[PDB]
Design a protein around this ligand. Structure first.
Ligand SMILES: [Mg+2]
Ligand SMILES: [Mg+2]
Ligand SMILES: [Mg+2]
Ligand SMILES: [Mg+2]
Ligand SMILES: [Mg+2]
Ligand SMILES: [Mg+2]
Ligand SMILES: [Mg+2]
Ligand SMILES: [Mg+2]
Ligand SMILES: [Mg+2]
Ligand SMILES: [Mg+2]
Ligand SMILES: [Mg+2]
Ligand SMILES: [Mg+2]
Ligand SMILES: [Mg+2]
Ligand SMILES: [Mg+2]
Ligand SMILES: [Mg+2]
Ligand SMILES: [Mg+2]
Ligand SMILES: [Mg+2]
Ligand SMILES: [Mg+2]
Ligand SMILES: [Mg+2]
Ligand SMILES: [Mg+2]
Ligand SMILES: [Mg+2]
Ligand SMILES: [Mg+2]
Ligand SMILES: [Mg+2]
Ligand SMILES: [Mg+2]
Ligand SMILES: [Mg+2]
Ligand SMILES: [Mg+2]
Ligand SMILES: [Mg+2]
Ligand SMILES: [Mg+2]
Ligand SMILES: [Mg+2]
Ligand SMILES: [Mg+2]
Ligand SMILES: [Mg+2]
Ligand SMILES: [Mg+2]
Ligand SMILES: [Mg+2]
Ligand SMILES: [Mg+2]
Ligand SMILES: [Mg+2]
Ligand SMILES: [Mg+2]
Ligand SMILES: [Mg+2]
Ligand SMILES: [Mg+2]
Ligand SMILES: [Zn+2]
Lengths: 115, 75, 135, 177, 51, 66
RNA sequence: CCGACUUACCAACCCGAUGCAAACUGCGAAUACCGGAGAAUGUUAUCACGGGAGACACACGGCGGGUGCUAACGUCCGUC
RNA sequence: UCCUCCUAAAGAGUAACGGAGGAGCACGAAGGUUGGCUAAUCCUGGUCGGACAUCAGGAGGUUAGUGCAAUGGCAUAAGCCAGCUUGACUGCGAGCGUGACGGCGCGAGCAGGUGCGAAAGCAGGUCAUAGUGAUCCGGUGGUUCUGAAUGGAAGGGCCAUC
RNA sequence: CGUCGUAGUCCGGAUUGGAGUCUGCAACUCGACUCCAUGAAGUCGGAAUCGCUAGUAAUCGUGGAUCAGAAUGCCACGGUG
RNA sequence: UGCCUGGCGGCCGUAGCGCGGUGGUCCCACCUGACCCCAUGCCGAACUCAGAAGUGAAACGCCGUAGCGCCGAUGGUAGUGUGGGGUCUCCCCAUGCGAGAGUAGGGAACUGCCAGGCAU
RNA sequence: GGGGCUAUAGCUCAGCUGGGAGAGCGCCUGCUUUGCACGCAGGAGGUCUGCGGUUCGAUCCCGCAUAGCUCCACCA
């Protein structure tokens, strides 16, 4: 099922790397959710956020839900806005644009990452 | 007899080999399948023609897991 | 006689016959007949040499035919002009290079193998020699 | 509900002890029950598929999937794409409730019953058994059926070798032999 | 062969028309799309008419 | 599940002659009175009789004896 | 009915060893070809434009091959 | 005549009454986009069910599929399912490939306007190569462009088109 | 008098399994009959053909000869007609 | 910084398969439940949403394993550019380039960036 | 070398934009007949020449072979 996840994911990744745009990749497990902004160097991250980090974790009863996704998305949008990245492209990485991932995208849009 | 016919050959192959300073939009490879996939600023056309999207030097590369033979364009 | 029971294409090119052979070692049996010349055997010649050596050893001990005719040679008929297509397919040949082991034999004395392969080599168009196994 | 709670109560304990499993997750579950009516004259006429849809709706409260042909054969004279059969997958609580109804009502109604066979176990665990007439379920009105049908049930369980599936259904006290 | 060439005429008052091909002996229904019409420069409706 | 597409499926009362009454979720619409349950079907005590072979030599020796 | 059992039977997938292929490639040279740098040399030998044509029946020899019979001072092509 | 492979000698070309094949179309969805999915065959078990319908599971990994002949491709799928739809749009086009020429083909981008998607983005027809016809003479629909004194008109031109 | 409701039926009774009684030295080949069960075909019959003129045709029973047991036949008798 | 795990890569089989062992504090997977947001040409399987009792069986990761796969020299051989010779359907000599298959052998990958855990 | 053909025991349609084998005769069995022909009534029928390909599937599409039928094998 992880190979099915990669099989859904890899189209947008190879097209976006062909384009040459700075990508905000997400990742969603049922307990935690991660994100990072990776430049078109392909292998070097810029800013990174996760709900494993305690500054983002000490604000809600559960760490794997929609509101903690909103918190980690607002945090990664703040860190990318601080390092100076304005337009990214949203790599949902095989997961549907729904639920926690949509809360992350809405949070980064309402915080300032204009993608 | 039954076997006179043959078509008129469609001039396939590679046109600019690697290291030839290409202009923008020029045709590198004419082919029928994607023998050569596209890479850093090469556009794949309708009949899998490879046209250089940007100026520079053609540079063939063999990347990817299944050893597919991509084409790039330097500057 | 000895022809392939099914083929992709009916008529084949002529082609040259240069280069040295492959099946030089006597793999299966013990006593082999190695073609030192270069030419084409046919189905007629292979069946003739096989039935000659079978008469020679009186059907005792195993025979091995190694090369098999699978290249069709065509012939235009008589009173036919040169044009109008490639001619009809008549018979089948087997290309031999210098070094090809044609027949092998075991379950026979050495001297009876010598006599048998002489008797069958005198019905083949290519010059052949005798050979034994090695290790 | 009753067999799911009883399975979590007693069958897990007995299977883990009598097969010496190290942890507790090694006991074989049941994951799906598949009902299938592969009807023949669906290409001779269409109305058999809606009557079979009513049939499987009565055997279980789902609406059945009208499955079609994969490849085109000729000894049955079906083309590629014709709707052949009708199936139902049951997973979880609906599977449990229908499984209880089957094991306590329906298999008491097979005509000339002498126990379900024991070779039918597909070498892995997944049970499979056909029932000749669909009337043996208590939900079929015998005075309403016009065309005799019949189906097969396929209980896919997640055992490793079918000796464990045999032990699981025997600890569920199936009527086998 | 069995194909019948038709013209999709405009709706927006022009005599403009595209040429298309309808299989006019197994799909009898009227074709009607929303195509560009370069005199109004606005994507308007185009109906199937007799060539 | 999808809401509309299925028929209804609710709990019924299956009373049988064997003393067994089962409130099980089913699709009949009303009450139900079973012929045989899983508690009275003659498999748990039937198959030792149900083939009924007997003995031919004892049939002989019953119908006459010397 | 169950065909129990076979005769020194045939025969498919498999595996082991053996060959062949213009219309086979899980491999793959030499030369050729294209593009860049360099030195020498060559009567600019290259390119574009304009005036004038001729020629479009070729032949044999070397190598690579297709008809043919690995026949022809045969025929049809590539390169010299 | 047009397309595919060989002939064809590792760029392109390259002949014969040389060797094998196909076309003279189909599609208002079989196109676009989004989202999802992965085959051939064989084994085992199973109601009518038979070597072969449907169902479960396995071994196998492109041995299948492409509307169609073969070749080159294809898993990011170009293959298979569903939603929404007309980019199967209009004017243009750097820069090339290809041919004696008529021609033929590939094209990032620009202006207008639209489709799908949340958005980045994709869409100027289909996996690609076949699916066809130069000129003349007319027909149909637009266009003040000329209108043989002037005002019209016939006719002619241009644009789409048989 | 009740029942049955035009159906393969409460029609038809074949065939098959079990259990039997009698006759007879002896019912397997090869008897009759009873009981229980099973309930095939058959839904009025093509071409053609037969019998009958009155107590006849049609339909329903009963007996005898032969005969240990073994007649849907043969020979007779009446009943409705 | 010592190791472990998650992510995105570099790379494309010395990197893949097989056999055996191992890890759950953390992470991950399985799991619990789903009228619900959302989904099924039927089905909370998938998709998704609420969550954390259990487990490390499966899956995933790590570790040993030459049973395969894979890589692979040195030499030799085939071939071939140029010049020459012969018994000229094929070769040979001077020279230049030198395969494929196989052999010795190699071989259970390596690496960058971030984040989290453990004493470090 | 080119057309057209091979289908019950013999003679013939049906191949016809690929999924039903259709008649008269020969034959079997009844009926009428002193019997046999004739007539009536009811019937089982056939490798669609064969062998491989071609799509799911070949009476149909293709190649090869067999077998009979016609047309052509001229100019010196
Ligand atoms: Mg050669
Ligand atoms: Mg050779
Ligand atoms: Mg080759
Ligand atoms: Mg000049
Ligand atoms: Mg000329
Ligand atoms: Mg000439
Ligand atoms: Mg000439
Ligand atoms: Mg010449
Ligand atoms: Mg020459
Ligand atoms: Mg030559
Ligand atoms: Mg020649
Ligand atoms: Mg000459
Ligand atoms: Mg010559
Ligand atoms: Mg070439
Ligand atoms: Mg060349
Ligand atoms: Mg997609
Ligand atoms: Mg089966
Ligand atoms: Mg598509
Ligand atoms: Mg398409
Ligand atoms: Mg195509
Ligand atoms: Mg003219
Ligand atoms: Mg004017
Ligand atoms: Mg005027
Ligand atoms: Mg009465
Ligand atoms: Mg009646
Ligand atoms: Mg009765
Ligand atoms: Mg009947
Ligand atoms: Mg009288
Ligand atoms: Mg008496
Ligand atoms: Mg008597
Ligand atoms: Mg779940
Ligand atoms: Mg494990
Ligand atoms: Mg070497
Ligand atoms: Mg080597
Ligand atoms: Mg290794
Ligand atoms: Mg390993
Ligand atoms: Mg007669
Ligand atoms: Mg047919
Ligand atoms: Zn009961």
């Amino acid at each position: 099922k992880k190979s099915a996840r990669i099989r859904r994911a890899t189209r947008a990744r190879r097209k976006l790397q062909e384009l040459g745009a700075t990508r905000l990749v997400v990742h969603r497990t049922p307990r935690h959710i991660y994100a990072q902004v990776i430049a078109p160097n392909g292998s070097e991250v810029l800013v990174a956020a996760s709900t494993v980090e305690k500054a983002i974790a000490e604000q809600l009863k559960y760490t794997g839900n929609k509101d903690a996704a909103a918190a980690v998305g607002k945090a990664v949008a703040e860190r990318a806005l601080e390092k100076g990245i304005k337009d990214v492209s949203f790599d949902r990485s095989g997961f549907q644009y729904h639920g926690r991932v949509q809360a992350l995208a809405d949070a980064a849009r309402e915080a300032g990452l204009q993608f | 007899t039954r076997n006179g016919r043959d078509s008129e050959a469609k001039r396939l192959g590679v046109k600019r080999f690697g290291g030839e300073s290409v202009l923008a939009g020029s045709i590198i490879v004419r082919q029928r399948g994607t023998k050569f996939h596209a890479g850093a600023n090469v556009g794949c056309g309708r009949d899998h023609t490879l046209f250089a999207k940007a100026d520079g030097k053609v540079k063939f590369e063999v990347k990817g897991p299944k050893n597919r033979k991509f084409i790039s364009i330097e500057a | 006689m000895l022809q392939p029971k099914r083929t992709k294409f009916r008529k084949m090119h002529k082609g040259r016959n240069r280069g040295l052979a492959q099946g030089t070692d006597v793999s299966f049996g013990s006593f082999g007949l190695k073609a030192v010349g270069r030419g084409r055997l046919t189905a007629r010649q292979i069946e003739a040499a096989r039935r000659a050596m079978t008469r020679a050893v009186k059907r005792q001990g195993k025979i091995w035919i190694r090369v098999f005719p699978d290249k069709p040679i065509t012939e235009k008929p008589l009173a036919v002009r040169m044009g109008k297509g490639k001619g009809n397919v008549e018979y089948w040949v087997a290309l031999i290079q210098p070094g090809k082991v044609l027949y092998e034999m075991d379950g026979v004395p050495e001297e009876l193998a010598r006599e048998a392969f002489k008797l069958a080599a005198a019905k083949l168009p290519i010059k052949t020699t005798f050979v034994t196994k090695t290790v | 509900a009753k067999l799911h709670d009883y399975y979590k109560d007693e069958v897990v304990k007995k299977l883990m002890t009598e097969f010496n499993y190290n942890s507790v997750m090694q006991v074989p579950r049941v994951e799906k029950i598949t009902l299938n009516m592969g009807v023949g004259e669906a290409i001779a006429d269409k109305k058999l598929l809606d009557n079979a849809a009513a049939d499987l709706a009565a055997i279980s409260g789902q609406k059945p999937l009208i499955t079609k042909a994969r490849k085109s054969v000729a000894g049955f004279k079906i083309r590629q794409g014709y709707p052949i059969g009708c199936k139902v997958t049951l997973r979880g609580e609906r599977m449990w409730e229908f499984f209880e109804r089957l094991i306590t009502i329906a298999v008491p109604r097979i005509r000339d019953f002498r126990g379900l066979s024991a070779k039918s176990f597909d070498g892995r665990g997944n049970y499979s058994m056909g029932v000749r007439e669909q009337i043996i379920f208590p939900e079929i009105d015998y005075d309403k059926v016009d065309r005799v049908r019949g189906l097969d049930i396929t209980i896919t369980t997640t055992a490793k070798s079918d000796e464990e599936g045999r032990a699981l259904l025997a600890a569920f006290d199936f009527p086998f032999r | 062969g069995i194909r019948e060439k038709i013209k999709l005429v405009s709706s927006a008052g022009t005599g403009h028309f595209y040429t298309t091909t309808k299989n006019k002996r197994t799909k009898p229904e009227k074709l009607e799309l929303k195509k560009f019409d370069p005199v109004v420069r606005q994507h308007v409706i185009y109906k199937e008419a007799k060539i | 599940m999808k809401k509309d597409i299925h028929p209804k499926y609710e709990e019924i009362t299956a009373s049988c002659s064997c003393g067994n009454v089962m409130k099980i979720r089913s699709t009949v619409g009303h009450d139900l009175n079973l012929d045989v349950c899983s508690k009275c079907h003659p498999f748990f005590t039937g198959k030792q009789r149900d083939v009924a072979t007997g003995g031919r030599v004892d049939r002989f020796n019953k119908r006459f004896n010397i």
